[PDB]
Design a protein around this ligand. Structure first.
Ligand SMILES: [Zn+2]
Lengths: 51, 50, 88, 122
RNA sequence: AAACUUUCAACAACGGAUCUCUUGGUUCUGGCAUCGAUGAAGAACGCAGCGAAAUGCGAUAAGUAAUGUGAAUUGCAGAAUUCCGUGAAUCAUCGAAUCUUUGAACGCACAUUGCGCCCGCCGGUAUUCCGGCGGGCAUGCCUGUUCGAGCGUCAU
RNA sequence: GAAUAAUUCUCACGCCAGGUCGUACUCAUAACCGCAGCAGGUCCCCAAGGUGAACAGCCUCUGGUUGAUAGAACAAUGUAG
RNA sequence: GCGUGAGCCCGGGUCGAACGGCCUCUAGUGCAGAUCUUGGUGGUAGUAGCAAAUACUUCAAUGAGAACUUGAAGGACCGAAGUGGGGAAAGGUUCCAUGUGAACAGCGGUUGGACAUGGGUUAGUCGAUCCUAAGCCAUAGGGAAGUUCCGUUUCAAAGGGGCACUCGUGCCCCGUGUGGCGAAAGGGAAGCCGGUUAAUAUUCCGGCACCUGGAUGUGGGUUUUGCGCGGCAACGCAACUGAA
RNA sequence: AGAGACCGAUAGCGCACAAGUAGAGUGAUCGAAAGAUGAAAAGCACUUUGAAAAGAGGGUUAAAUAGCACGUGAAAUUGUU
RNA sequence: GUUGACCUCGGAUCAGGUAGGAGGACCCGCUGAACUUAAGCAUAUCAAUAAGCGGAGGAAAAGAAACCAACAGGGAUUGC
């Protein structure tokens, strides 16, 4: 989790407050990241081509 | 069981990946002989040793 | 109850995966492999069966390093680069 | 663009090399994001990018490797990876300089009675 | 007289013998001497534009660099080059590199992706705490270095 | 260890952080072991109303099933009552 | 057609790439049997049989096709030491959605734990991680030609605590020592309620809490009699120095 | 690397093929079956019956008496005349 | 008393080094059977072999006589 949080800041300049992880049945790790309330998600997803 | 170890988890992941039919072009390549998968597994037929 | 009745009482494992041969032959209570002899320094091997010997001998695996010595010997274990090369 | 050619990469130094290395990673990461939900001719770029990075990596490593080989020369001890590797058995034979030394008494006889070049008539 | 059982022929069925073939075996002869702590043989997990197996490779991952040849690959798509030179290829050769987790396996252990210690750099008020990065910590023995034990023992 | 402050007060309030792996579903007259979707075997937790001495036997509520190849006739000999 | 005979030669049909006569040489050289070896196929035969666990019925819909698909309405069983609601070992995607030819579900099948394509398992508070039990294995040593057997405190020179520099180097104290593994049912720091998804929740959302570790400030307390007062007492309170 | 008075898919090594693979046993270990369309896929457009699988016409080829159950196609055994 | 030597036994993540494993067709050693033959069987034979253990190379081992002989004497070792 420490590496994931630091990496996100250096790539997308976004800050988080909580990160959860799990290991899928196929063998890859999926990470949920929640953003600070002062920033909205949708626009960042569109700006960074998410959805 | 719901209690597993990382090694047992890892083995199950690989054993799940290698069980699906052959893609389609492979039977349309020049000088090919494969017909149907010869190493199909099924959870209610044959257990391999973990 | 000598047979069928007493087969439903089996739900324990006497062997597990071995770290050195990947075979399920690690005795759980003894903690020695019944095929490779782990944790002994040297690998189990016996001459009263040569079928079992051939099943694990040189040339039945990837051979990541040994399979490139024939070429190096033929060429004389040299070093350097051809005169006309580039990149220094 | 396209693949970076191996010909120009040799005439550089570490500063541009690391900038080119750094930038290349950026487009590769982002261009991958497009791959999800859309398939196109851009997929070809993904293969070209990865392959280009490999070339630049080897060049930086090779340039660095050559530099310190010169530095450690004319020295008795040098790192284990820069020492020549032939064979475990081949690194332990006696050197030809020492496998050819002889004793004074053996040398004394051979200086005055060596093998000669004779012939016999019939 | 039909039906049924039996025999033979023609055609049609079940099954894979016979005939011909062979990038496969077996035997003999000839040449050569090359694994490993600079981490071997073996094992596990991964890598393709579209792949499960076989074959190949290791986060530089269906391969990189360098030399030679000289116009492809091919199941589909897509591009690449085009001949000046700035060079296709699952090509051939191969002298430079990369080489995950393990394995004689080496910090202590392992039915655990468990628990430690030392040095340096970067953040958080920080020599002592937390996080990130790099380099290290096995046993037997030999030669030398340095620090020590002994009324074993020498001279003041 | 103080006399203009000193304080090593287990009192109240206030600041920062808490790494790694498992988590789906069955647990059985079809998901385990018996060559199988086999009347066999396999460790536990919660436990309503009535009759009644009672977790006995018999009927019911919550909850769950209506799944085991079918149609027609009623001879011998059977199996069970 | 020939020969007493093992056999040889020809006519007709099918088929598609090699093959014979004569004299010598050579051998893994001639089949009905061996409860012979491998493979294939019959009579029995559309026969034995598909009979434990009380049981089904009417209307409508989908569909080429309905006793064993769905909805509604009846009639029944399990009868809380359940055919209920959850778990340990074991299983390994069997969970959910959409669609479906053949094969499987010892009858059928539009249905399925079968087939094809996608999705699904979030923790400082639940466990593992920590400690030892029965027991296993290194170290000092002694056996054995040797793979290795014994040995676990033993005839061992076996450690750990503090401080300061200019700084790593330097100083000062205590010592018989006394290693690792071994429990998802033993010992053990800390989380509850309400809601949400086709599929997860003491984890996700809202509210209200708790434990451990680390640096620090304000309020209050104590002190010029330097480290608090009260109750006869059992004792009380928001604090109220304590190294070997 | 070169050869044979060797064997020719029940033979020759257990393996001419994704073979020390699939599969069995808790384990040491045990361990198979499976080669051939045609010179070239030119691997059957289109019409019509059928819910579909498929059938009948019509096509490619020297031959479909070669149609991915594919060279040649014997006997046991079966159907029609 | 102080100081400086010697001998034996130790510490150090001191400087520099080296062995384990694989392969084992051929080679050098140790340990070591029984089936079978004798028409029974115990010495004997199978056999100074199979299985087990240790150690190397492209070859290994042996080798320049405390030899053979009894001759008018030969002259390291290895193989046919
Ligand atoms: Zn093993």
């Amino acid at each position: 989790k420490a590496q994931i949080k630091q990496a996100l800041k250096k790539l997308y300049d976004i800050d988080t407050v909580k990160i959860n992880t799990l290991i899928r049945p196929d063998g890859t790790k999926k990470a949920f990241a929640r953003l600070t309330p002062d920033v909205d998600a949708l626009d960042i997803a569109a700006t960074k081509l998410g959805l | 069981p719901s209690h597993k170890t990382f090694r047992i988890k890892q083995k199950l992941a690989k054993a799940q990946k290698q069980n699906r039919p052959i893609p389609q072009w492979i039977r349309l390549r020049t000088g090919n002989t494969i017909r149907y998968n010869a190493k199909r597994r099924h959870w209610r037929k044959t257990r391999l040793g973990l | 109850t000598k047979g069928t009745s007493s087969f439903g009482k089996r739900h324990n494992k006497t062997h597990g995966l071995c770290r050195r041969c990947g075979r399920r032959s690690l005795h759980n209570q003894k903690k020695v492999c019944a095929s490779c002899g782990y944790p002994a320094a040297k690998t189990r091997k016996y001459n009263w069966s040569e079928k079992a010997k051939r099943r694990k001998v040189t040339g039945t695996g990837r051979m990541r390093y040994l399979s490139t010595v024939p070429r190096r010997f033929k060429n004389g274990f040299r070093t350097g680069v051809p005169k006309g090369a580039r990149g220094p | 663009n396209g693949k970076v050619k191996a010909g120009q990469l040799w005439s550089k130094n570490k500063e541009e090399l690391t900038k080119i290395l750094g930038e290349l990673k950026t487009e590769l990461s982002q261009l991958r994001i497009q791959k999800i939900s859309s398939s196109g001719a851009k997929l070809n770029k993904i293969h070209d990018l990865r392959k280009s990075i490999a070339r630049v990596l080897t060049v930086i490593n090779a340039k660095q490797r050559a530099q310190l080989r010169l530095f450690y020369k004319n020295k008795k001890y040098l790192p284990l990876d820069l020492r020549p590797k032939l064979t475990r058995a081949l690194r332990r034979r006696l050197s030809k300089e020492d496998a050819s030394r002889v004793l004074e008494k053996t040398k004394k006889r051979l200086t005055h009675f060596p093998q000669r070049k004779y012939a016999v008539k019939a």
